[PDB]
Amino acid sequence: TVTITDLARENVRNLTPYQSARRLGGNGDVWLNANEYPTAVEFQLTQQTLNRYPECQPKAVIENYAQYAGVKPEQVLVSRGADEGIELLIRAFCEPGKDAILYCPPTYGMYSVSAETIGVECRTVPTLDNWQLDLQGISDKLDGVKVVYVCSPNNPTGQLINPQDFRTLLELTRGKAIVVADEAYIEFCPQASLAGWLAEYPHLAILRTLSKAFALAGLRCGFTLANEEVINLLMKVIAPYPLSTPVADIAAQALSPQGIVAMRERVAQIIAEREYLIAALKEIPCVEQVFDSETNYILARFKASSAVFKSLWDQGIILRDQNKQPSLSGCLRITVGTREESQRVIDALRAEQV
Amino acid sequence: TVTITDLARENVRNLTPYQSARRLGGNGDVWLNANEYPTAVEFQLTQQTLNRYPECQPKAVIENYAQYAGVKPEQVLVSRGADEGIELLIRAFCEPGKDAILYCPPTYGMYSVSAETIGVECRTVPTLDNWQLDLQGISDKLDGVKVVYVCSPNNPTGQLINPQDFRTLLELTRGKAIVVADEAYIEFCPQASLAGWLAEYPHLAILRTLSKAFALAGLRCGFTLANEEVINLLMKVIAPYPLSTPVADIAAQALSPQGIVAMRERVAQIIAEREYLIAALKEIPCVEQVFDSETNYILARFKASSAVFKSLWDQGIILRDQNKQPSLSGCLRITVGTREESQRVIDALRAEQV
Ligand SMILES: *Cc1c(COP(=O)(O)O)cnc(C)c1O
Numbered sequence: 211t212v213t214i215t216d217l218a219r220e221n222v223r224n225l226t227p228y229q230s231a232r233r234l235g236g237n238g239d240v241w242l243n244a245n246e247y248p249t250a251v252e253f254q255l256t257q258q259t260l261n262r263y264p265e266c267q268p269k270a271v272i273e274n275y276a277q278y279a280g281v282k283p284e285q286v287l288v289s290r291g292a293d294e295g296i297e298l299l300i301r302a303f304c305e306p307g308k309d310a311i312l313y314c315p316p317t318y319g320m321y322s323v324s325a326e327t328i329g330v331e332c333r334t335v336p337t338l339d340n341w342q343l344d345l346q347g348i349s350d351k352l353d354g355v356k357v358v359y360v361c362s363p364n365n366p367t368g369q370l371i372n373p374q375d376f377r378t379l380l381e382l383t384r385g386k387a388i389v390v391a392d393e394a395y396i397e398f399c400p401q402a403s404l405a406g407w408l409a410e411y412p413h414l415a416i417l418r419t420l421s422k423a424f425a426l427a428g429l430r431c432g433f434t435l436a437n438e439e440v441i442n443l444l445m446k447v448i449a450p451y452p453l454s455t456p457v458a459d460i461a462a463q464a465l466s467p468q469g470i471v472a473m474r475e476r477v478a479q480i481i482a483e484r485e486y487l488i489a490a491l492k493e494i495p496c497v498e499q500v501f502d503s504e505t506n507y508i509l510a511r512f513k514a515s516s517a518v519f520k521s522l523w524d525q526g527i528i529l530r531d532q533n534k535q536p537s538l539s540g541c542l543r544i545t546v547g548t549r550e551e552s553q554r555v556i557d558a559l560r561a562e563q564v
Numbered sequence: 565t566v567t568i569t570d571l572a573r574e575n576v577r578n579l580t581p582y583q584s585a586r587r588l589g590g591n592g593d594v595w596l597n598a599n600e601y602p603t604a605v606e607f608q609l610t611q612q613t614l615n616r617y618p619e620c621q622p623k624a625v626i627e628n629y630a631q632y633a634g635v636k637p638e639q640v641l642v643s644r645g646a647d648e649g650i651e652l653l654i655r656a657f658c659e660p661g662k663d664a665i666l667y668c669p670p671t672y673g674m675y676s677v678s679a680e681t682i683g684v685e686c687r688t689v690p691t692l693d694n695w696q697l698d699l700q701g702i703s704d705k706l707d708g709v710k711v712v713y714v715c716s717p718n719n720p721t722g723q724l725i726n727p728q729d730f731r732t733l734l735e736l737t738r739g740k741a742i743v744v745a746d747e748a749y750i751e752f753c754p755q756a757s758l759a760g761w762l763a764e765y766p767h768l769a770i771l772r773t774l775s776k777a778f779a780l781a782g783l784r785c786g787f788t789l790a791n792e793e794v795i796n797l798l799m800k801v802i803a804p805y806p807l808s809t810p811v812a813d814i815a816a817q818a819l820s821p822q823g824i825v826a827m828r829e830r831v832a833q834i835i836a837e838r839e840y841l842i843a844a845l846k847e848i849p850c851v852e853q854v855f856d857s858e859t860n861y862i863l864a865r866f867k868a869s870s871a872v873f874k875s876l877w878d879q880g881i882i883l884r885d886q887n888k889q890p891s892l893s894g895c896l897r898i899t900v901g902t903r904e905e906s907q908r909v910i911d912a913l914r915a916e917q918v
């Protein structure tokens with residue numbers, strides 16, 4: 211007798227699906243756990259052509275994004291969020307059971323999830339104490355590695371990776387592996403993007419998204435920026451129609467010049483609010499340390515983090531626990547929402563302090 | 565010196581991407597090449613929550629579909645079209661380089677495309693002369709096979725697969741492989757669905773879509789119907805957020821009771837129009853034979869098919885060439901559109917006849 215489960219691939223039977231969920235519908239009122247823009251930006255459909263298939267790579271979207279990012283349109287690929295971008299890279303360059311990817315914890319969990327689901331070895335090299343790259347460590351473990359992911363600014367720690375070190379990492383991987391800079395949060399520190407580096411690195415790829423600064427996580431729309439050769443290789447493994455018409459429709463609107471202007475005003479907003487929360491947190495008794503941030507979230511180390519986490523959780527204030535992340539013992543990640551929401555966190559944290 | 569291309573997986577470098585495209589914007593006026601409903605059905609967004617991530621499996625969608633299909637909600641999975649459903653199945657049960665899938669040409673090209681892109685052997689067993697299953701042939705080639713795809717009604721031939729043979733196929737794969745019935749066109753012959761067979765076959769999976777009868781190809785929304793055990797296994801390999809909010813929003817509307825009522829009226833419409841075109845075609849001189857259809861498209865064998873195809877193509881009448889499909893030499897697939905469109909085809913075909 212054979213069960214359906216016995217027919218499933220070994221790795222599929224043993225893996226643990228990504229822990230993104232942690233809901234409590236109608237239970238909590240303050241959501242600061244997913245790094246989402248705190249307020250809804252409305253968009254209405256303009257293309258009533260739903261009976262016809264869309265273009266594999268909607269032209270308006272690709273062009274509007276290329277324009278915004280300062281790259282050529284043939285250097286842009288649009289997918290169902292950065293999540294799909296992460297997948298495509300592995301799908302195109304990593305031979306299952308032979309090649310490996312490499313990332314440096316503590317960082318985003320999707321790199322690992324995709325490789326493990328697909329069947330590609332996950333090589334890890336923890337970042338240093340300040341979360342910068344352990345360059346020497348990476349140099350000793352590139353054998354068999356085809357793709358290297360590096361998040362900058364990094365989630366959940368918040369800091370930018372030393373560009374000087376990216377230079378080094380790019381040199382170590384030249385002719386050996388693709389380096390993928392996850393710039394999910396680059397909108398908050400646009401001047402640190404590596405997008406202008408494409409002309410000197412044929413193996414550099416960049417992940418972008420509309421789920422954060424752009425306040426359109428609901429659209430599940432993201433992009434990959436890379437040289438022609440890389441984009442075309444990725445186009446060979448992508449689904450024929452990855453983007454729905456309604457998403458292409460509104461994404462193109464969100465990327466219009468006026469759209470870009472509003473996105474930037476949302477950024478200035480979050481940055482000013484972030485600096486407020488950062489200043490206040492450091493003064494709260496139960497707060498041991500607040501780490502610098504170039505994003506829309508703050509990592510802080512608390513006294514009895516689990517107790518604090520649970521207390522605020524029961525009060526409708528949902529944060530993201532980082533307690534099990536390597537080196538982040540006692541840390542919680544706080545998303546930057548509105549002034550009201552930041553005040554809720556502050557007032558709740560002040561109620562602890564034992 | 566190593567090129568980026570040298571870093572790509574071997575199979576990725578050698579594969580040929582699916583041939584779905586064949587556009588000529590503003591050149592042709594009659595589109596009958598993609599099996600799309602001929603007329604746009606409008607839908608407007610109702611959920612302005614785009615700044616927040618959606619549910620991995622939108623509850624309204626899953627439930628409305630389960631209700632429509634007559635199955636339990638825990639037996640339903642929603643994805644970015646049947647295309648993603650096809651992928652998920654392979655991703656969960658086929659070990660790259662070890663297991664294989666099996667399909668029977670001439671049929672849908674995505675099964676092969678996904679397996680080849682992922683790295684899974686494609687086993688083939690052509691259907692008999694009348695396109696029914698070569699049961700004996702399949703029985704001799706199941707070793708190493710984990711997933712079997714069978715399209716019914718079949719694309720591009722149009723006929724339903726003998727249910728009696730599905731019984732046989734399901735018995736041959738019991739405890740060895742998952743049988744996937746692609747019911748992309750079952751809406752046009754709903755009584756032939758295998759959806760009610762779930763209770764007796766733990767390895768049966770069914771592909772469904774909103775791109776055809778439902779006239780919402782633009783939404784890139786599809787489903788997989790299977791027993792709990794199978795759905796849960798597929799849920800372990802699916803992307804965290806496969807459906808965008810706008811798609812979940814409108815798909816749920818399209819699946820409301822009133823939505824179902826309209827879908828069925830679209831079906832009756834296409835069926836009546838199909839029978840018209842079928843009757844007329846058979847009388848046209850350049851038409852050698854018209855094959856029976858239980859879908860929204862007709863396969864017909866022509867005299868000098870390539871010449872006919874090109875002639876109509878230059879007149880703005882776009883059909884789908886099947887000339888390179890195994891056993892379909894001289895056949896073109898005609899999608900059923902409006903009465904006007906059918907008349908255009910008829911009048912154009914009558915202009916040939918040499
Ligand atoms: C949120 C986030 C993303 C975005 O993914 P999408 O699929 O585009 O929603 C990517 N990377 C990191 C590190 C993130 O935190």
Ligand SMILES: *Cc1c(COP(=O)(O)O)cnc(C)c1O
Nearest residue numbers: 645646647672719748773775786
């Ligand atoms: C059109 C079609 C589909 C539908 O795919 P979607 O991704 O849901 O648009 C599936 N199977 C066959 C055989 C088809 O012809």
